[PDB]
Design a protein around this ligand. Structure first.
Ligand code: EUU
Length: 110
């Protein structure tokens, strides 16, 4: 996953993100969390991430490596499961959407 990203790669990456942004379980991860939404959220999580910031980032070719792309995506799943207890629907959203991301990510690697 260390090989530099090509222009063709970025097209693949854009679709993964749209695939993700359209998922019915992605609604808590589309935008940066609203501190009204989550009481103490920004005291708790040292590195928040959401799908608009990756979209911004892809757009701007922030990503030199798949490694770095998966890094950001996993941060969104990790943050939710850390901040949220195992039985929150937000946590279950993280479960559903991460396997989807792994399904889609497996598609891209091939
Ligand atoms: C009680 C703590 C629950 N914790 C949460 C809550 C949320 C959350 C809540 C509402 C939400 C969105 C997104 C839209 N809305 C609707 C209202 C949009 N505007 C700003 C008013 C997210 N996201 C996570 S998360 C990212 O999975 O960690 N955790």
């Amino acid at each position: 996953v260390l090989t530099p990203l090509t222009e063709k790669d970025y097209e693949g990456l854009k679709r993964v993100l749209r695939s993700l942004q359209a998922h019915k379980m992605a609604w808590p991860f589309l935008e940066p969390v609203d501190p009204n939404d989550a009481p103490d959220y920004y005291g708790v999580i040292k590195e928040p991430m959401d799908l608009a910031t990756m979209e911004e980032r892809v757009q701007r070719r922030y990503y030199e490596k798949l490694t770095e792309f998966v890094a950001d995506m996993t941060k969104i799943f990790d943050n939710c499961r850390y901040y949220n207890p195992s039985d929150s629907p937000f946590y279950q959203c993280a479960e559903v959407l991460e396997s989807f991301f792994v399904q889609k990510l497996k598609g891209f690697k091939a």
